[PDB]
Structure 1
Amino acid sequence: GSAVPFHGAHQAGIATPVQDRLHFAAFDVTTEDRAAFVALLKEWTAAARRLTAGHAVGEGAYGGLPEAPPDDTGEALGLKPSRLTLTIGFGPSLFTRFGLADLRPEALADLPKFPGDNLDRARSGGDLCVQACADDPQVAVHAIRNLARIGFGKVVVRWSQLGFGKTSSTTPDKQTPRNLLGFKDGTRNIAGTEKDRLDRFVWAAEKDGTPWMTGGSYLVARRIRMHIETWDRASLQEQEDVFGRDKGEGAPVGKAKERDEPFLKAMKPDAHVRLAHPDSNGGATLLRRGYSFTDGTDGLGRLDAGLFFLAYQRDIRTGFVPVQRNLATDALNEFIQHVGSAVFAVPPGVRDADDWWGSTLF
């Protein structure tokens, strides 16, 4: 239940080992006062320092003046830091405010429309996001809930997604988690230890064209419904054919071990791994960091379940966009549907205790 350092050239929550649980919130800004928004970012940064150390925000959750509401709502008392990370991003829509228009990064591209999209606009977009990842779901919910409260009057919660289990890995030496289709998910990703690959594929560089984004990254979120009724009636072979790996061990078809390298020509041409592989996409590589969800029932007698997909990359135009375009013929398409979407510019890290979220932009 240890604590992930909050400061760094890069924000935590990206290369960091993937924590077991997720609370993701998109916010919309309701103030048009740049000074007030800057003040919010500083307050938020200070609260995140405490929250990620497992401490209450401000003066605490109790023991203050009886006539004052407590600084912290208290539901994380007695819990551990739980490897909490808090990662902020800025949406394209934010750059219509605070005189920021000319600072929107080129690499923060709006996505094209994709075949089979059914995007719920109310569960899409957002002026900004906060990604809360922790091994304890209540540590994550508490962070989001208290950030929202601190921002009362200046921002609102547009949409929020709980992820009950991870479907990603930045630690290939560790057990790979499974998604709700029963397959290991995260085998061939990017590790936090592969500093070279993160520099190449994840972190924006000064020369890419947006100096304030140096050391940040670009994030794509996709809420993906899974047609579990359809999947659960499919034979084992069909499921294995869909991905290009076997279900039990997770090894590429033909091979014996999960982490044996794919031999792509042995997979079906519409196999998910074959279409998504960097070698099929001009080298394009993603840091996938998604989680599973279930939100009630569909009103039709079935659980509503899916995968809240997250992908970090140096440039949306060289990462998610080409790979997703190449999944147009993916056999997995028969079993999923994209029903929410948003993109964000994730600024560089909080350098020290004097720095604050977004300082390079503001």
Structure 2
Amino acid sequence: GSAVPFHGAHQAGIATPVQDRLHFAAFDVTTEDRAAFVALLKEWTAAARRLTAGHAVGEGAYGGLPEAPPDDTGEALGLKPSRLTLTIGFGPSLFTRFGLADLRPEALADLPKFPGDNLDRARSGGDLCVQACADDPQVAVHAIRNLARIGFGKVVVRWSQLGFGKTSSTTPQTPRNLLGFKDGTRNIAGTEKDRLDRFVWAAEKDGTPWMTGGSYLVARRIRMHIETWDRASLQEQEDVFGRDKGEGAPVGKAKERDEPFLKAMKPDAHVRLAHPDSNGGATLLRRGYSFTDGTDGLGRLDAGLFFLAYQRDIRTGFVPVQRNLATDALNEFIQHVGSAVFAVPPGVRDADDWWGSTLFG
């Protein structure tokens, strides 16, 4: 049973190895009391220490007083830690509370409206987020379900998204997204300490001292028009990305990890427009997950990519790259239907520290 250390200078779940499953939940805060919210962050941190070690929260899921509800709802009993990481983030709307308005980082910028946005307000925004990643989806769901229960009366669940990537028990190998293309070939790796400092981690010179060691998260629920995509020819699909579908190699190259020659790609191929060379060097840490929630009323597959990007500054990461996708040939086949941004605070340093301690003090 593998576990990921909860404590560190950075929150786990960003540069740590990508787990198979995701349960992402945005919460809205319903209390105005700063002291009550800080108390909740401490209880949540205590619970997160237990959950990421594979233990039940509080006094356990059974064996307590019969007249009392158990502290843990119990559906993770007998399961492994499953590399569970719990990553918290603070939304822009949180800073309108608790007198925090002047502590919102400038790097936590509102996203502009992008062409083709069809954002569902109910699946967007949120005062805070908890990203729960694990190899077992029931471990992730158990974590979110119990954090929400502990927070009841102080927070509510605004929206939640289940996601999946590869299945590590059977898969060695770049995963493929639901379009059939390898996804993640040219990404910041967790082993690239220098590129993380340059592009992912907030530094104290960036202007917000309490965010040092943290990062900024952009979440985009991107629906795929599956049935339209599946009717396109193989050449159209490969032209859209600039990589072949079988190997994932850039056009004109042989291997997946051959560095691309952007001029051989069509001008509005996804890779050519998203590449850092096309965006003044802007580089992103993509950590998204595929989703399939079912089928809509027309019988179409409600599926897509729950896109998650971590970066040092939203204005120099997601925004320029996404702006450059305005003519992306991929736009024919996708629609952004949900969006949120979060400031992901630094890590919990030790057993006495707590989520958001550098912001709330």
Answer whether TM exceeds 0.5 for this pair: yes
* Alpha-carbon distance, 1:117 to partner: 0.4
Contact preservation (8 Å) 1:244, 1:267: yes
CA–CA distance in structure 2, aligned partners of residues 19 and 358 of structure 1: 24
The 3 A distance-change label for structure 1 pair 322 and 188 is same
Contact preservation (8 Å) 1:58, 1:72: yes
For 1:182-222, what per-residue CA distance to the aligned partner results, in whole angstroms no more than 9, with x for missing partners?
00100000111100000000000000000000000000000
Corresponding pairs, count: 360
1:139-150 aligned within 5 A:
139-150=139-150
CA–CA distance in structure 2, aligned partners of residues 336 and 70 of structure 1: 44
CA–CA distance in structure 2, aligned partners of residues 167 and 161 of structure 1: 18
Contact preservation (8 Å) 1:189, 1:288: yes
CA–CA distance in structure 1, aligned partners of residues 358 and 4 of structure 2: 23
Give 3-state SS (helix, strand or coil) of 1:317's partner.
helix
* Alpha-carbon distance, 1:53 to partner: 0.5
For 1:296-351, what per-residue CA distance to the aligned partner results, in whole angstroms no more than 9, with x for missing partners?
21110222111100000000000000000000000000000000000000000000
For 1:9-47, what per-residue CA distance to the aligned partner results, in whole angstroms no more than 9, with x for missing partners?
000000011101000000000000000000000000000
CA–CA distance in structure 1, aligned partners of residues 94 and 167 of structure 2: 29
Contact preservation (8 Å) 2:22, 2:131: yes
* Alpha-carbon distance, 1:166 to partner: 5.4
TM-score normalized by the length of structure 1: 0.97
CA–CA distance in structure 1, aligned partners of residues 155 and 223 of structure 2: 28
Give 3-state SS (helix, strand or coil) of 2:196's partner.
helix
TM-score normalized by the length of structure 2: 0.98
CA–CA distance in structure 1, aligned partners of residues 200 and 138 of structure 2: 29
Give 3-state SS (helix, strand or coil) of 2:54's partner.
coil
Mind listing any 5+ residue stretches in structure 2 that lack a counterpart?
A: none
Contact preservation (8 Å) 1:90, 1:346: yes
Contact preservation (8 Å) 1:108, 1:345: yes
The 3 A distance-change label for structure 1 pair 168 and 128 is farther
CA–CA distance in structure 2, aligned partners of residues 250 and 48 of structure 1: 38
Contact preservation (8 Å) 1:224, 1:308: yes
* Alpha-carbon distance, 1:64 to partner: 0.5
Give 3-state SS (helix, strand or coil) of 1:166's partner.
coil
The 3 A distance-change label for structure 1 pair 314 and 169 is farther
CA–CA distance in structure 2, aligned partners of residues 296 and 241 of structure 1: 29
* Alpha-carbon distance, 1:170 to partner: 18
Give 3-state SS (helix, strand or coil) of 2:316's partner.
coil
1:298 equivalenced with 2:309 (yes/no): no
For 1:97-144, what per-residue CA distance to the aligned partner results, in whole angstroms no more than 9, with x for missing partners?
011011000000000000000000000000000000000000000000
Contact preservation (8 Å) 1:90, 1:345: yes
Contact preservation (8 Å) 1:122, 1:159: yes
Give 3-state SS (helix, strand or coil) of 1:132's partner.
strand
CA–CA distance in structure 1, aligned partners of residues 170 and 131 of structure 2: 16
Identity across aligned pairs (percent)?
Answer: 100
The 3 A distance-change label for structure 1 pair 168 and 139 is closer
CA–CA distance in structure 2, aligned partners of residues 170 and 312 of structure 1: 28
CA–CA distance in structure 2, aligned partners of residues 171 and 204 of structure 1: 33
Contact preservation (8 Å) 1:169, 1:189: no
The 3 A distance-change label for structure 1 pair 53 and 168 is closer
CA–CA distance in structure 2, aligned partners of residues 122 and 281 of structure 1: 31
Contact preservation (8 Å) 2:20, 2:168: no
CA–CA distance in structure 2, aligned partners of residues 279 and 167 of structure 1: 32
* Alpha-carbon distance, 1:171 to partner: 13
Contact preservation (8 Å) 1:28, 1:158: yes
For 1:217-236, what per-residue CA distance to the aligned partner results, in whole angstroms no more than 9, with x for missing partners?
00000000101111000011
The 3 A distance-change label for structure 1 pair 331 and 170 is farther
1:176-191 aligned within 5 A:
176-191=174-189
Mind listing any 5+ residue stretches in structure 1 that lack a counterpart?
A: none
1:28-43 aligned within 5 A:
28-43=28-43
CA–CA distance in structure 2, aligned partners of residues 267 and 33 of structure 1: 55
1:107 corresponding residue in structure 2? 107
CA–CA distance in structure 2, aligned partners of residues 148 and 231 of structure 1: 37
The 3 A distance-change label for structure 1 pair 170 and 260 is farther
CA–CA distance in structure 2, aligned partners of residues 211 and 169 of structure 1: 41
Contact preservation (8 Å) 1:166, 1:179: no
CA–CA distance in structure 1, aligned partners of residues 111 and 171 of structure 2: 29
The 3 A distance-change label for structure 1 pair 338 and 126 is same
* Alpha-carbon distance, 1:164 to partner: 2.6
* Alpha-carbon distance, 1:165 to partner: 2.5
CA–CA distance in structure 1, aligned partners of residues 264 and 73 of structure 2: 55
Give 3-state SS (helix, strand or coil) of 2:359's partner.
coil
Give 3-state SS (helix, strand or coil) of 2:169's partner.
coil
CA–CA distance in structure 1, aligned partners of residues 142 and 319 of structure 2: 33
1:86 corresponding residue in structure 2? 86
Give 3-state SS (helix, strand or coil) of 1:360's partner.
helix
CA–CA distance in structure 2, aligned partners of residues 171 and 281 of structure 1: 33
Contact preservation (8 Å) 2:117, 2:336: yes
Give 3-state SS (helix, strand or coil) of 1:160's partner.
strand
* Alpha-carbon distance, 1:151 to partner: 0.1
CA–CA distance in structure 1, aligned partners of residues 167 and 77 of structure 2: 28
1:130 equivalenced with 2:130 (yes/no): yes
Give 3-state SS (helix, strand or coil) of 2:272's partner.
helix
Q: Which range is displaced more, 290-299 or 115-124? A: 290-299
